């Protein structure tokens, strides 16, 4: 809306089950944007 809000949602853990949540993944994905940011500041 014009007035963003929130609500209570519960989700249950999934015990015996597409995205890799390894730190490795995030550092790779973020590497370039860091450099981009450093440069723009420079």
């Amino acid at each position: 809306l014009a007035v963003p809000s929130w609500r209570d949602h519960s989700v249950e853990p999934l015990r015996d089950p597409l995205e890799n949540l390894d730190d490795s993944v995030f550092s790779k994905r973020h590497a370039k944007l860091e450099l981009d940011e450093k440069r723009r500041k420079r």
């Binding site: 963003p4 999934l14 015990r15 089950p17 949540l21 730190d23 994905r29």
Partner: protein, 272 residues
């Protein structure tokens, strides 16, 4: 455009665009782990993560604990991914926020509500370790479902408690969210009125600056908005009267923050 996130026990509507990288920025919903703040585009990823992740608090150091609130100090160089994820989270609710990946130059102070399940993020501020203008806050945020409870003013008070231990003055770095703008005005006014009430206004601007770590400019600005300062033709002089101070501390407009920082509960010193 990310329209909403699920984080902990809330689905929260996003207020603003945030540059979640690659395809993540295109999702209408993202799921964030409430403890390590990693984002995910698929609900199942989130649900699996729930039972795998062993974090029940921010990384870094718990430097404040009073009743059910704790503050954790997180150095952007020690926990870069967490901090990048924090900034992306923040940007969803912060209009004017501009870096989110170059986190090494920042320390982050994460405000948490603590229960038996863990320490739950409710807000934060970032602080540039080496500010050339001595800014003691870069960005500050209370997450929407926790707003209106005094957490913003707590974090602001907290930033000055850090500056006090550093024995320096400090000021937030422009720009601040409009909500931040009002919290500062309210916090500064209260703090100064508390002192001018108890010292019968017999101190200089410099004195006030030393007692609070609020810069002289910000003290002057606040006193102007309170109509309690005048430019004697060379310098700014405090002009306070019992009537002014009493009828200000009365108008509910100026109220003590509901949550204040207890110095004895802060275990911290600046680096060295």
């Amino acid at each position: 455009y990310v329209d909403k996130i699920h984080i902990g026990n809330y689905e929260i509507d996003a207020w603003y665009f945030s540059p979640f990288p690659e395809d993540y920025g295109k999702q209408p919903k993202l799921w964030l782990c409430e403890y390590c703040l990693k984002y995910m585009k698929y609900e199942k990823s989130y649900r699996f993560h729930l039972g795998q992740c062993q974090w029940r608090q921010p990384p870094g150091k718990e430097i404040y604990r009073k009743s059910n609130i704790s503050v954790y100090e997180v150095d952007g160089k020690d926990h870069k991914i967490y901090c990048q994820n924090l900034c992306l989270l923040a940007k969803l609710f912060l209009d004017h926020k501009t870096l989110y990946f170059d986190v090494e130059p920042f320390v982050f102070y994460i405000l948490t509500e603590v229960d038996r399940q863990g320490a739950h993020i409710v807000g934060y501020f970032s602080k540039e370790k080496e500010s050339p203008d001595g800014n003691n806050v870069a960005c500050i945020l209370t997450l929407p479902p926790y707003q209106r409870r005094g957490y913003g003013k707590f974090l602001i008070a907290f930033s000055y408690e850090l500056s006090k231990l550093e024995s320096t003055v400090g000021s937030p770095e422009k720009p601040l969210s409009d909500l931040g703008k009002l919290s500062y005005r309210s916090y500064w006014s209260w703090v100064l009125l508390e002192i001018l009430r108890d010292f019968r206004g017999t101190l200089s601007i410099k004195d006030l600056s030393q007692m609070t770590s609020i810069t002289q400019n910000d003290i002057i600005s606040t006193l102007q908005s309170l109509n309690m300062v005048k430019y004697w033709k060379g310098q700014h002089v405090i002009c306070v009267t019992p009537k002014l101070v009493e009828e200000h501390l009365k108008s509910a407009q100026y109220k003590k923050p509901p949550i204040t920082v207890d110095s004895v509960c802060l275990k911290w010193a600046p680096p060295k």
